Design a protein around this ligand. Structure first.
Ligand SMILES: *[C@@H]1O[C@H](CO)[C@@H](O[C@@H]2O[C@H](CO)[C@@H](O[C@@H]3O[C@H](CO[C@H]4O[C@H](CO)[C@@H](O)[C@H](O)[C@@H]4O)[C@@H](O)[C@H](O[C@H]4O[C@H](CO)[C@@H](O)[C@H](O)[C@@H]4O)[C@@H]3O)[C@H](O)[C@H]2NC(C)=O)[C@H](O)[C@H]1NC(C)=O
Ligand SMILES: *[C@@H]1O[C@H](CO)[C@@H](O[C@@H]2O[C@H](CO)[C@@H](O[C@@H]3O[C@H](CO[C@H]4O[C@H](CO)[C@@H](O)[C@H](O)[C@@H]4O)[C@@H](O)[C@H](O)[C@@H]3O)[C@H](O)[C@H]2NC(C)=O)[C@H](O)[C@H]1NC(C)=O
Ligand SMILES: *[C@@H]1O[C@H](CO)[C@@H](O[C@@H]2O[C@H](CO)[C@@H](O[C@@H]3O[C@H](CO)[C@@H](O)[C@H](O)[C@@H]3O)[C@H](O)[C@H]2NC(C)=O)[C@H](O)[C@H]1NC(C)=O
Ligand SMILES: *[C@@H]1O[C@H](CO)[C@@H](O[C@@H]2O[C@H](CO)[C@@H](O[C@@H]3O[C@H](CO)[C@@H](O)[C@H](O)[C@@H]3O)[C@H](O)[C@H]2NC(C)=O)[C@H](O)[C@H]1NC(C)=O
Ligand SMILES: *[C@@H]1O[C@H](CO)[C@@H](O[C@@H]2O[C@H](CO)[C@@H](O[C@@H]3O[C@H](CO)[C@@H](O)[C@H](O)[C@@H]3O)[C@H](O)[C@H]2NC(C)=O)[C@H](O)[C@H]1NC(C)=O
Ligand SMILES: *[C@@H]1O[C@H](CO[C@@H]2O[C@@H](C)[C@@H](O)[C@@H](O)[C@@H]2O)[C@@H](O[C@@H]2O[C@H](CO)[C@@H](O)[C@H](O)[C@H]2NC(C)=O)[C@H](O)[C@H]1NC(C)=O
Ligand SMILES: *[C@@H]1O[C@H](CO)[C@@H](O[C@@H]2O[C@H](CO)[C@@H](O)[C@H](O)[C@H]2NC(C)=O)[C@H](O)[C@H]1NC(C)=O
Ligand SMILES: *[C@@H]1O[C@H](CO)[C@@H](O[C@@H]2O[C@H](CO)[C@@H](O)[C@H](O)[C@H]2NC(C)=O)[C@H](O)[C@H]1NC(C)=O
Ligand SMILES: *[C@@H]1O[C@H](CO)[C@@H](O[C@@H]2O[C@H](CO)[C@@H](O)[C@H](O)[C@H]2NC(C)=O)[C@H](O)[C@H]1NC(C)=O
Ligand SMILES: *[C@@H]1O[C@H](CO)[C@@H](O[C@@H]2O[C@H](CO)[C@@H](O)[C@H](O)[C@H]2NC(C)=O)[C@H](O)[C@H]1NC(C)=O
Ligand SMILES: *[C@@H]1O[C@H](CO)[C@@H](O)[C@H](O)[C@H]1NC(C)=O
Ligand SMILES: *[C@@H]1O[C@H](CO)[C@@H](O)[C@H](O)[C@H]1NC(C)=O
Ligand SMILES: *[C@@H]1O[C@H](CO)[C@@H](O)[C@H](O)[C@H]1NC(C)=O
Ligand SMILES: *[C@@H]1O[C@H](CO)[C@@H](O)[C@H](O)[C@H]1NC(C)=O
Ligand SMILES: *[C@@H]1O[C@H](CO)[C@@H](O)[C@H](O)[C@H]1NC(C)=O
Ligand SMILES: *[C@@H]1O[C@H](CO)[C@@H](O)[C@H](O)[C@H]1NC(C)=O
Lengths: 177, 1038, 50, 50, 50
């Protein structure tokens, strides 16, 4: 149990490091801008809506309700520890990374959050798969329209379907069992 | 008579083992420092006879004044039964003799005041009376004076002494010094000590401490001598030092222990009082039974506290066998028969398993293995009735002895001999019934002892006819276990908010755990919540900073010792102590739980030493226009040497299964080969490990098909890297930073310790360095081509100019600022040598990996000390102890446990190796994709982008000194997605049209080098009729 | 415990993959085609999950 | 003087002191190492090596 | 590895047949229960290993 305590501390270090380079790569704990002027990129279901005092969004609630059967998540040897980054501020990270790629684009990781506009950030995005950003400048309003529809269909596959929930359910359920 | 303090003094030596500049924490009898002590008085007329117990030992120290104190009586109790250690002291010497002590009042000696010339001090001398057992009789060897100090420990009579000979410069109390106390002699004696009594030489009739199973972390010296000592829990920084085994600890939370709290233990509860148990009408009955006609009636489905009938005050006899009658209610039984009948008064003795009499002969037999209690009760003033109580008869004739609890009622024509009766009795035809005949004036022998038999019939049938054990007041809101008829659990037992049904008696959760319980005595309901649990990891900085700790509790409801000598700021992680809250949330330093980081701080204004915590916020939110307009692009950059480190391999510990286990033991090998295969599969799997990371070492280092020597012509042009190129002037062909790293990394240390068969690396130091040299030479001077087949030389002035464009940067900025680039490159190298000389944080994880390697080997070896029902590390002693047949039958399971221990160890070895292969293919990824080239994919080769990395030697590891382009300015200004000129948009595929407002220029996505709009860079494509926030601009042709 | 450690190994390998997704796939665009989901990959929006 | 045994950093037998004389000794496991046989393919002859 | 999985049945720990059922039949059903207890613990060892 000395070595296994070491191993579980290793588990803790690996998991919160996973958190770190997955979430806490940000050099500045960060929050969403007040206004929302994007060009049809409705983010209510994803971005933390300032309407709810908690900084989560519609799909966060959909996720939670879909996997409420977390079983343990506590009583007997079930010495679960809360995340080293709490759910509310891990959502704050979600927002941070969100707005980071929205504003400081891909340059975000290189240091300071050198913000750029999201709509023209997609220009580098199209140019990132070999298609010139002219298509952005030529159809991007519609691009946003079917993008929003795609997110709505994602929500549909979240609520009336479990396809988007599959291997999350599998991993949490296998941890549980 | 005030008390005093102790600082650190009183450290002994464990045993004769010799160590060398190591840090051990072997556990034995220890002295708590900072523990309460006492300062006595010296003659200047109090007796001064401090006589305390020897509990777990005694800590002692003194300064002699006139050779006054010599008398000690170390014993158990001194009832003229236990020994005593007589002591003598000349000038600077010791001697011990042990035997008896028999004196009253005040034993002591005396030195007279007004002695004319001299004296001898042996007149009173209450020292010896009959020295009749003196086995360990071992004899050998004007301001303030020196100091003495004696400590001991009780180990099977080893009253081992420890002494020191050096003066001190404190006259009031204990010195402000620290030292060990080396052992002098360990007498074996053989009679223990628990009480120590002392006497001394005073005309008319000296610190005392105590020991406990404390803990320590020693730190010896290159001379193999004790230097200091620290406990663990006395101040939680000491706990950190204990769990990390170092006196210079970096700041961090280190898991200390859990706390298995249990306030007011637990409550035992059974249902409400019995129902349908009218014992009175069966035991105080008017209607009893005859002895041969003993009645038989059951009691069932109602409980019986066998003590209430005991205190019901209605019997004269209480005999119960087998199980304890007192508080027998806590035991639950199948069923009980409660029968009442009448026999002779003298026969209480005869009512027991195995006893005899006419009752057993013809009337009533009792089982030899009776399972029940037996009671007789007196009503001597009611045992007879007018007309005589002869109603109940007894048997005088019976041919057969009764079977256990067999009842004979048959009253047929009795036959004794072979001459019959024809239904009519007479001579040789014996009447089988006679009556009791109770008269008011009868003697005590016939004066009834009316007995009642309680038999507990515990067959295989269920046990629910039981006793009310301890049904008491419900314990609300106190974390306790419970005993509801057989179920337990730490419950928050209060009124619970749920609906309940008749089928409901016990409940589980989805995880099958007790979450709700129900009151069995009445219609009440309860819930359970895990009350406290939680471990402790102390948030304190290291010995470099203060010793004022902060302690955290993990998810446990503030119900254990609030802030006091033993502030509080509650958090989601639990009850936080030893650290006052701070409103501001600084940049984190050490996460503790629920995202709180605590840094020790001093609020200078009096001087308080307390740690302060806060929540997770690297500064605050950055306020820039994030909707549509602001664009930020750095007009300046930096090149930080992101010194990330990757473990390229691992010690090729090709263990030899048998020789690891069976050294100088053919019996062990013989028994192992019965299990056989296993350790062999372990062995070649480990060899597969070895070849796996050696292939990793090859393809990361000998990826070139050729050995190459660094050119001795260092014309790199003002950019040099001499600290990383092996300078041809050293015995080990590794450069400066390898020297610094290898000096920093230490500790297994050699290939010649034990069954720890360290294989030499497939690449030894000089030639792994040769590969590193080859790699750096190539990637600096020929590059990808010498890493991808045929060599083609390339100057570094172009080796990195290519890879700005390989990232997105342009080699023009290199040509424009490369002299500086080099200067800050050397600055980065200086940062390397500085922050890696003694600062281990940046060089952490390679040393860390060789650590879990080291303590993996360490748990491998001390797993032998984990004797699995054995009495030694290795059974070699046990191997010789028993006959090779008996050796077979013991070494079977013993060394079976040993081989499963091997399997466990090699399993963590496999898993470690697995993550090592992950990291090793990662190292290949780095080297090949990023040094023989460049990972155009963003920010994978260390923080920021990547240009170069320089393979530098590291035991089973490497550092990749990334040259990363890192922005330095925030030109966070207005934007233009494209250039709507006449319905069309001007834009390069890369780049953004940017301006502070003066001139809209195109500039690269990671460097602010704005440029004129030109038809070459900016080429028309598509249109701009669908945009979100565009502004117009003109276009020109250069 | 060994099963949990092994599962930790696989999940943490997936987690380094997750960090790589964060980098080449959120903090950047994977020029390496078609691993960030079916089809190509432009970018992605991270979001919490237990 | 009080010492008689020895140890090392890895907490294994390194040095011992003679109970009959004072001498600063060392102990090292005999040879161990290994036996890895080098040889060409057995399609080539039996010129052996250890 | 498959051949291993097969051949630790030869690694019979104190029994003398591949499949333990005949060892079970070789001892009295209580005594066979006792011996099969630790044959099956060893077999679980083999399972968890493989
Ligand atoms: C265990 O206890 C016995 C008790 O007798 C010791 O025996 C004596 O040991 C001492 C020293 O240990 C011996 O002195 C010897 O001195 C020799 C030098 O010779 C010169 O000095 C002598 C002094 O009288 C002159 O007479 C002579 O002419 C020379 O001028 C050394 O050469 C001896 O060394 C031998 O013994 C030691 C161990 O003592 C070994 O290590 C050496 O290899 C060598 O064999 C020695 O030092 C004395 O002579 C002994 N006398 C007897 C009667 O035994 C043992 O020595 C002690 N064990 C140990 C290990 O010391
Ligand atoms: C660990 O054990 C080692 C083994 O002995 C110790 O080595 C000893 O070190 C001391 C000094 O460090 C040497 O002492 C010698 O003393 C003579 C004469 O002493 C005069 O000078 C000293 C000042 O040094 C003065 O205080 C005295 O009063 C004398 O006037 C000097 O001339 C020498 O140069 C040397 O200092 C021992 O000889 C040496 N032992 C040997 C070589 O066997 C070591 O000190 C121990 N570790 C520690 C930390 O003490
Ligand atoms: C981007 O997405 C959000 C997602 O909620 C969108 O919110 C939408 O807001 C409009 C008005 O602001 C809602 O229109 C409705 O119109 C009827 C007409 O009578 C009115 O009665 C309603 O009260 C409401 O105003 C619309 O329902 C709502 N959509 C959803 C899904 O909630 C909105 O398009 C965007 N939000 C931004 C840019 O802040
Ligand atoms: C077994 O346990 C107790 C023993 O009587 C019972 O609870 C106690 O009795 C009733 C409820 O049954 C509570 O009300 C009291 O009733 C008495 C008798 O009428 C009345 O004189 C009092 O003024 C009071 O109203 C009583 O408070 C309660 N005891 C306590 C301490 O609260 C319980 O019901 C019994 N259950 C069974 C199944 O026998
Ligand atoms: C470029 O970025 C920096 C910070 O990254 C910007 O500085 C920040 O500017 C915002 C508003 O532009 C400031 O918010 C407001 O500041 C005023 C006075 O400082 C205050 O009275 C308001 O209550 C509000 O907080 C913010 O403080 C300031 N500093 C930060 C965020 O650290 C800068 O404005 C950006 N450049 C341009 C041209 O916008
Ligand atoms: C040690 O010596 C004692 C002798 O002292 C006796 O005990 C004293 C308390 C006191 O009563 C003296 O007068 C006694 O002479 C041994 O004690 C006796 O030993 C014998 C056998 O050797 C035994 O039968 C007696 O019961 C012991 N006690 C007494 C009171 O006589 C004792 O055995 C010796 N050994 C040890 C280990 O204590
Ligand atoms: C000094 O210590 C030793 C024991 O450690 C003892 O010395 C004895 O002293 C007396 C008186 O001079 C002598 O007759 C004895 O011969 C000495 N002992 C031996 C073994 O030689 C004594 O305890 C201390 N000295 C004094 C005077 O008390
Ligand atoms: C060791 O110390 C004990 C502590 O009192 C002495 O007392 C006896 O200890 C034994 C076993 O440890 C018990 O069985 C007895 O009941 C104890 N007797 C009493 C009166 O407590 C014990 O005598 C000491 N050892 C020796 C050899 O004397
Ligand atoms: C980019 O920033 C660096 C420093 O980070 C600048 O280097 C300094 O330049 C000035 C003048 O150009 C010199 O006086 C300093 O000695 C330089 N070194 C320092 C300050 O350490 C560099 O000049 C900047 N880039 C440009 C194009 O000016
Ligand atoms: C190449 O780098 C080396 C670094 O080792 C520089 O060598 C230093 O030279 C100065 C003066 O000759 C010495 O005082 C130092 O001791 C040398 N070593 C150091 C600083 O580590 C050398 O100057 C560099 N060459 C060029 C052209 O810049
Ligand atoms: C330690 O000494 C102080 C002096 O006042 C005293 O108050 C305290 O009770 C002592 N503690 C114990 C229990 O030894
Ligand atoms: C602890 O539990 C009790 C149960 O009544 C509750 O009242 C209290 O608020 C809890 N405190 C915390 C914060 O754990
Ligand atoms: C704590 O800090 C917040 C930060 O906005 C501030 O609003 C609040 O007034 C502060 N309160 C105290 C007591 O310092
Ligand atoms: C604003 O624009 C001018 C261009 O004339 C530029 O020199 C200046 O640096 C810009 N402001 C800042 C803060 O960079
Ligand atoms: C950006 O949005 C703000 C508010 O919606 C508006 O005032 C501004 O003109 C917009 N700029 C562009 C370029 O769309
Ligand atoms: C053995 O086979 C190898 C395989 O290429 C070949 O090179 C070698 O010449 C052969 N030698 C003999 C003696 O068959």
């Amino acid at each position: 149990c000395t070595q296994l305590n070491r191993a579980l501390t290793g588990i803790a270090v690996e998991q919160d490091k996973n958190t770190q380079e997955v979430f806490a790569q940000v050099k500045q704990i960060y929050k969403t801008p007040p206004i929302k002027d994007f060009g049809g990129f409705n983010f209510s279901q994803i971005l933390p809506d300032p309407s709810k005092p908690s900084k989560r969004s519609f799909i966060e609630d959909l996720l939670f309700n879909k996997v409420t059967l977390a079983d343990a998540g506590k009583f007997n040897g079930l010495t679960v520890l809360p995340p080293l980054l709490t759910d509310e501020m891990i959502a704050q990270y979600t927002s941070a990374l969100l707005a980071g790629t929205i504003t400081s684009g891909w340059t975000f990781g290189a240091g300071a959050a050198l913000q750029i506009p999201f709509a023209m950030q997609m220009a580098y995005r199209f140019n990132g798969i070999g298609v010139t950003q002219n298509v952005l400048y030529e159809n991007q309003k519609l691009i946003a329209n079917q993008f929003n529809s795609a997110i709505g269909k994602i929500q549909d596959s979240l609520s009336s379907t479990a396809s988007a929930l599959g291997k999350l359910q599998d991993v949490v359920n296998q941890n549980a069992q | 008579p005030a008390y005093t303090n102790s600082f650190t003094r009183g450290v002994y030596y464990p045993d004769k083992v010799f160590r060398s500049s190591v840090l051990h924490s072997t556990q034995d009898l220890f002295l708590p420092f900072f523990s309460n002590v006492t300062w006595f008085h010296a003659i200047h007329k109090r007796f001064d006879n401090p006589v305390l117990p020897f509990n777990d030992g005694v800590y002692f120290a003194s300064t002699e004044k006139s050779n006054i104190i010599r008398g000690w009586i170390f014993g158990t109790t001194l009832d003229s039964k236990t020994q005593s250690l007589l002591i003598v002291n000349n000038a600077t010497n010791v001697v011990i003799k042990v035997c008896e002590f028999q004196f009253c009042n005040d034993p002591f000696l005396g030195v007279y005041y007004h002695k004319n010339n001299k004296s001898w001090m042996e007149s009173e001398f209450r020292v010896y009376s009959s020295a009749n057992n003196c086995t360990f009789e071992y004899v050998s060897q004007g301001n303030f004076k020196n100091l003495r100090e004696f400590v001991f420990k009780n180990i099977d009579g080893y009253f081992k002494i420890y002494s020191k000979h050096t003066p001190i410069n404190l006259v009031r109390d204990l010195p402000q010094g620290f030292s060990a106390l080396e052992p002098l002699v360990d007498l074996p004696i053989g009679i223990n000590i628990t009480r120590f009594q002392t006497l001394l030489a005073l005309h008319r009739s000296y610190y005392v401490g105590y020991l406990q199973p404390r803990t320590f972390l020693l730190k010896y010296n290159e001379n193999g001598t004790i230097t200091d000592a620290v406990d663990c829990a006395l101040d939680p920084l000491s706990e950190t030092k204990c769990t990390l085994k170092s006196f210079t600890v970096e700041k961090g939370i280190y898991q200390t222990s859990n706390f298995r709290v249990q306030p007011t233990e637990s409550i035992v509860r059974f249902p409400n009082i019995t129902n349908l148990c009218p014992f009175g009408e069966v035991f105080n009955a008017t209607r009893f039974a005859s002895v041969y006609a003993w009645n038989r009636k059951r009691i069932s489905n109602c409980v019986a506290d066998y003590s209430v009938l005991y205190n019901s005050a209605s019997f004269s006899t209480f005999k119960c066998y087998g199980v304890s009658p007192t508080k027998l209610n806590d035991l639950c039984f199948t069923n009980v028969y409660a029968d009442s009948f009448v026999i002779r008064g003298d026969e209480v003795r005869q009512i027991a398993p195995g006893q005899t009499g006419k009752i057993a002969d013809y009337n009533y037999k009792l089982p030899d293995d009776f399972t029940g209690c037996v009671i007789a009760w007196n009503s001597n003033n009611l045992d007879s009735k007018v007309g005589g109580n002869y109603n109940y008869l007894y048997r005088l004739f019976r041919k057969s002895n009764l079977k256990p609890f067999e009842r004979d009622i048959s009253t047929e024509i009795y036959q004794a001999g072979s001459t019959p009766c024809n239904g009519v009795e007479g001579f040789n035809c014996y009447f089988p019934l006679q009556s009791y005949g109770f008269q008011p004036t009868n003697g005590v022998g016939y004066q009834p002892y009316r007995v009642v038999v309680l038999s507990f019939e515990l067959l295989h049938a269920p046990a629910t006819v039981c006793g009310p054990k301890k049904s008491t007041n419900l314990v609300k809101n106190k974390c306790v276990n419970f005993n509801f008829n057989g179920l337990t659990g730490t419950g928050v037992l209060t009124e619970s908010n749920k609906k309940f049904l008749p089928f409901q008696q016990f409940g589980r959760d989805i995880a099958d755990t007790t979450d709700a319980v129900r009151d069995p005595q009445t219609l009440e309901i309860l819930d359970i919540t895990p009350c406290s649990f939680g471990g402790v990891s102390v948030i304190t900085p290291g010995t470099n900073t203060s010793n004022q700790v902060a302690v955290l509790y993990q998810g446990v409801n503030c119900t254990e010792v609030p802030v006091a000598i033993h502030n509080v700021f509650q958090t989601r992680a639990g009850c936080l102590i030893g650290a006052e809250h701070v409103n501001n949330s600084y940049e984190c330093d050490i996460p503790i739980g629920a995202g709180i980081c605590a840094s020790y701080q001093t609020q200078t204004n009096v001087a308080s030493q307390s740690i302060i915590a806060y929540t997770m916020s690297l500064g605050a939110e950055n306020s820039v226009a994030y909707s549509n307009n602001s664009i930020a692009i750095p007009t300046n950059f930096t090149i930080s040497v992101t010194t990330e480190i990757l473990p390229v391999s691992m010690t090729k510990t090709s263990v030899d299964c048998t020789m690891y286990i069976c050294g100088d033991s053919t019996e062990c090998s013989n028994l192992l080969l019965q299990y056989g295969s296993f350790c062999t599969q372990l062995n070649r799997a480990l060899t597969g490990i070895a070849v796996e990371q050696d292939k990793n070492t090859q393809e990361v280092f000998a990826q070139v098909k050729q050995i190459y020597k660094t050119p001795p012509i260092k014309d790199f042009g003002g950019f040099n890297f001499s600290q990383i190129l092996p300078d041809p002037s050293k015995p080990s062909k590794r450069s400066f930073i390898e020297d610094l790293l290898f000096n920093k990394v230490t500790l297994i240390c050699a290939q010649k310790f034990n069954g720890l068969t360290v294989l030499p690396p497939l690449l030894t130091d000089e030639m792994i360095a040769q590969y590193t040299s080859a790699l750096l030479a190539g990637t600096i001077t020929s590059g990808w081509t010498f890493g991808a087949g045929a060599a083609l030389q390339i100057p570094f002035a172009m080796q990195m100019a290519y890879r700005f464009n390989g990232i997105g940067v342009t080699q023009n900025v290199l040509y424009e600022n490369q002299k500086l680039i080099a200067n800050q490159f050397n600055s980065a190298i200086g940062k390397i040598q500085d922050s890696l000389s003694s600062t281990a944080s940046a060089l952490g994880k390679l040393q860390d990996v060789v650590n879990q390697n080291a303590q993996a080997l360490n748990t491998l070896v001390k797993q032998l000390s984990s004797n699995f029902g054995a009495i030694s590390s290795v059974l070699n002693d046990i191997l010789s102890r028993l006959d090779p047949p008996e050796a077979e039958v013991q070494i079977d399971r013993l060394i079976t446990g040993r081989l499963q221990s091997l399997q466990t160890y090699v399993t963590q070895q496999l898993i470690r190796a697995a993550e090592i292969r992950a990291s090793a293919n990662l190292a290949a990824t780095k080297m090949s994709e990023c040094v023989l080239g460049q990972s155009k994919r963003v920010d994978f080769c260390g923080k920021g982008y990547h240009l170069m990395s320089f393979p530098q030697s590291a035991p089973h590891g490497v550092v990749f000194l990334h040259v990363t382009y890192v922005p330095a300015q925030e030109k966070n200004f207005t934007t233009a997605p494209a250039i709507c000129h006449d319905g069309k948009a001007h834009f390069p595929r890369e780049g953004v049209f940017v301006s502070n407002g003066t001139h809209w220029f195109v500039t690269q996505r990671n460097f602010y080098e704005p440029q004129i709009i030109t038809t070459d860079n900016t080429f028309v494509s598509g249109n701009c009729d669908v945009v979100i926030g565009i502004v117009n601009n003109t276009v020109y042709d250069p």
